Design a protein around this nucleic acid. Sequence first.
DNA 1: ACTCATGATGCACAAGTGGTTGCGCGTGTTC
DNA 2: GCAACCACTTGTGCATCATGAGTGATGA
Lengths: 93, 93, 305, 292, 280, 241
Amino acid sequence: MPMTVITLKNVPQSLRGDLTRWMQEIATGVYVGNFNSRIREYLWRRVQETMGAGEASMCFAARNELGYDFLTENASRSVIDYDGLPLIFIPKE
Amino acid sequence: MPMTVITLKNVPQSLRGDLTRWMQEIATGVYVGNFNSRIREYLWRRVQETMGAGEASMCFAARNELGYDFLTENASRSVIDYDGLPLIFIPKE
Amino acid sequence: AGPIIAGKSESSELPRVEDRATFIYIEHAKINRVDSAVTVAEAKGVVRIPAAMIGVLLLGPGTDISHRAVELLGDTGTALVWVGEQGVRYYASGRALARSTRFLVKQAELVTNERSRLRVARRMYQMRFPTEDVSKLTMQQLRSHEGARVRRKYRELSKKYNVPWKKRVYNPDDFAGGDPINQALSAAHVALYGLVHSVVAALGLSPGLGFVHTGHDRSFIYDVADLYKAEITVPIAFAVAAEAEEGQDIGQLARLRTRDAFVDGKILKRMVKDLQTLLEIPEEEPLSLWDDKEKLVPYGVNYSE
Amino acid sequence: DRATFIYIEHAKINRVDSAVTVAEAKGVVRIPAAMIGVLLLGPGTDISHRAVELLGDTGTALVWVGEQGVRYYASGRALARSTRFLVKQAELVTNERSRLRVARRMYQMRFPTEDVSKLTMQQLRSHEGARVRRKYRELSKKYNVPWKKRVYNPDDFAGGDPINQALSAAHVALYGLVHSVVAALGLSPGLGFVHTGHDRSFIYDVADLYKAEITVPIAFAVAAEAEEGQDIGQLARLRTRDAFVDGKILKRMVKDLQTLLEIPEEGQIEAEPLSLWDDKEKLVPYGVNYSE
Amino acid sequence: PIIAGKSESSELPRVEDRATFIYIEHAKINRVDSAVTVAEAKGVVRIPAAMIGVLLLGPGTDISHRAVELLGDTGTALVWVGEQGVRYYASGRALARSTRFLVKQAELVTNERSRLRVARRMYQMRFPTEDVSKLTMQQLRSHEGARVRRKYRELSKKYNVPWKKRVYNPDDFAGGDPINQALSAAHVALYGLVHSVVAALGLSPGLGFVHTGHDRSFIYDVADLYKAEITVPIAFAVAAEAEEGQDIGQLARLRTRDAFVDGKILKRMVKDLQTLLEIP
Amino acid sequence: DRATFIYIEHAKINRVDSAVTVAEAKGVVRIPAAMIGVLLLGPGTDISHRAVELLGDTGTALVWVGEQGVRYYASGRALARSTRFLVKQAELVTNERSRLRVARRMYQMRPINQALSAAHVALYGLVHSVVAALGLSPGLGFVHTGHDRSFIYDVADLYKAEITVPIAFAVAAEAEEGQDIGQLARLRTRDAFVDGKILKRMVKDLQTLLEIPEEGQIEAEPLSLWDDKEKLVPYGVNYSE
DNA sequence: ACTCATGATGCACAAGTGGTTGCGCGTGTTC
DNA sequence: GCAACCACTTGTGCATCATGAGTGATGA
């Protein structure tokens, strides 16, 4: 099973504890767990309407030549497609 | 190639930029990348000799029921073994 | 679908019964739900349990668990078993995360019919001992023969590892021991029984509708666990007893090797498939009304006039 | 032949020698384990390992419930590990003759003034539909609550009339009590007679016996005396738990379950919904110590 | 010791196991905190240079000295893919410390019979349905040209795109047509990948067999093995499916990266570079 | 037959039409691209894409070096993208007779430990810069074989005994206690390399070792942008401040 | 001109403590 | 009694800025 990584910040503490039921916390707001496509999709679905006014970013194994892809919703660091290659973009203040 | 995740905080900026040459930084201090055992071991050895007075924790795919195992060096959250199942232990102040 | 809230999860969002981890053992701690998380709070620190990935949670001595923690564990499909000393002490589980009772209906139809029950017991005996043929054995003969061969296996494994065994058989009803072999056997068996109880509660099967064991609410748990107690728990416990040295926690290493054997033997998927085949269920809204002429009738409808 | 259904909430249960120690806010109570038949651990309950071990040694049925059993969360083994009710239910539901008889008996329980021993399943379900329509209409007339048709969404509770929300909440509270009683008695919630294919078919079958008598009037009263913007579901659940406080409903449920399973009256058990601080006088002679 | 910004070849992924290419334009490649950082007006993108073989530098890229040093340290070759073809090459020290491949390539390029045999194998690999056991050097050039124009014409007719009877050349191939842009983008990606692989394996890019006279001849020879198989059909498909207002270069690079991943051109390229030089 | 070796450091190179533009602290220098030859881009260099394109059009060998070529970091193509020197070196190295002859020719031509290592590494960097600019393959070495820089080591052995050794011994004698001897050795080696005579001699010996005919040889011109303004003004190199 | 180390300097976010409310998560005879 | 929400302090670390020092990673 692909390893799914979710990072939460400025989210309600309820979701902070809720994600621990599926995937553990290795650092403040960092989660890692092994799931298939369906469980991962449902878990990101749960995170989307539980994070409130917070930032969530998820990384999972994909079928690109880097080997992973990114899903972010209302996050500081967006993801830009450099010709079929996912690279993390950090906007400048 | 299994997915590997390294989390850094309170580390020199040199290491923060150096790990971006191997694995991308989705959020502050957390890195994601797909490497084999040799590259991951070399990256962890590089982290151990560059963070100095900092904390680092790495997550990678393993061959247990949870599917992953954890390596931490002077990290706030340690890792303890529950009958062969790695679960994150958060010390109480 | 519907609104998503912390602490409550649907069956789809959870892993399959055969895709989860086997068990976790907690002792001298205090399971407690803080911020919608099953948290194990020991003296030193707090440990968060990924209950969605855990099939059964084993509660040892000195373990305190709250009401909301039990509700959360039941919601995640994780079963609760108080694995104290002298074996399993109690069972607990929430609603089954399988909304279809087809497995339970088939199990009831098989257990009520005497010929079907005898056939199912013969199938279990054949699965335990594939080489033999039991097409003519009766129920009492089946029980006596299974006891005799379990005792023979215990004696053989005691001889192999050179450990003193007092011609005894493990039994969840009041089995106590102080020897390291007894402790290892108890640990492996309680882990197996917790896993079996979790699987049965997850599939919707009734733990009381047993075929070989009768007289209690966990007879089917014993029946399912006997299919594997001799092939994993006994040899692994004997190996643990042989390997154990002075000043070593027998339970810790016994459970470690029990989990290793469960993973290597693929006990979880094997148990799911064995329960599939034992009930003679071919591979394939759940609620409906019952009728004689039309069989099932759609529910949630009002029949006027 | 007597089973006590003890309800515990807002307490920490431990064990001393052979008695559970319910450390309430009022004080400490020392119920002997042997007298407890069914333990209904309500909200705010911290159960210990030794308490669970002692209660399971004496065949107590631990059921983690809501406030007065409105919600069923988890349950342990059966009352005295008695699977005779479960075996009887499985035998009754397996074949069509006993299933027909039990369905007729439940429909008769729902039809005191009519004889339905000759009606078919189609006729029986039509009669129940007519009965529930008439009950809804007459309760709407009595409580001055407008009523058009039972409309609701299992996935969208917010969108709906207050009467429908109250009905759903009260029915689910009744379902929780039914499941608590069933798990205490050792019955299988999935082995249903009229309802089939669901993991709580028997729960709905049993709760349908009390819907038209308990939860529907409660829901109509809640809808009548409700302000706009008020939590209708919480109100209905609280009213249902208040109705369940007495314990008469639970005893009636145990008796009706044993009647449905054709259990002979000699072998039938009697539920005793005991309370701790409201029944001190009854429990003192039984050995139940009290502290303050 | 381990110093930030410096790594051994062992710590880097093999040539096969890394990504193919990254294209950068209208940016400023820079090194901050020992990271290969690509700074745009809106923000900065930090490149995992250890996971990419070649970095294509499009128009508007201003790369610094230390950024080039870091990219060479990671083994990521640099190519300035401007308009009308590859414009300049760059590469650091080879991350292969053995020159067995280089010595073998030298000893098969100096010998005339060895050069003939290597060109024979490359023709056989490009066209396995023919026989060239007695075919000579200039005849090999003429046959290669005839077949590349035949492939170009066949693909132009198949995808229904007007082609002006030409074959892409790395030197001064300018065109405003969508087919010209797609061919240039796919070909510069291929040439950058070939240059990266050659620099990574320790081979000399100047020791060519069919192409001679310049220091990038072996690059052209290696790229010819895959030019007609992958890049030309990809460019023709891109021109066929291109819409109005769609950036030809971006979609062409999408398609050529997809072809490289599907065709396994990296592992295949290393394997071919092994077989052409007879390494058992 | 003139191959200028312009060393640019602390600058930002952009392109004006058919002329690169070097903007240092002293001022802005415009150079026609045809006379660049070898462009040694030292530290602090920010080369632009359009300047790279212009330099590539004119057969420029861009080599990213350290301070006065102490360290070799990266290199582009060769002089006029020519491979005659590389082909000659390959022909000499594959066969045994020419390899033995060239090895014999090299032999005929030919704290303290830390200083020696630093000086040798500086010489390696300069030799690699020259070799990459000329188009020679650093791996094809005659005396040394089996390494990526074998030819670099062979060429550096020519100058080890009379440049790096005296500098290393001088810095070892002059070293103060608790001082970075490697940095001192590198700085003294770059100071020695400032004049550029060593670069000319390396180019001359590289051409000689390949038996390149004297008529067809090209001579190195270690051009300085500011120290040689009077030499570049007639060449068309505009200056500004 | 580049890059890194360093010193202020501020700021977003997390973890703790403190009372206060509630006991919770709502389909199954609705087309 | 338990657990979530909430206010509110308290604190750790990150990012920016300005200054000054180096041009660097050191094997035949």
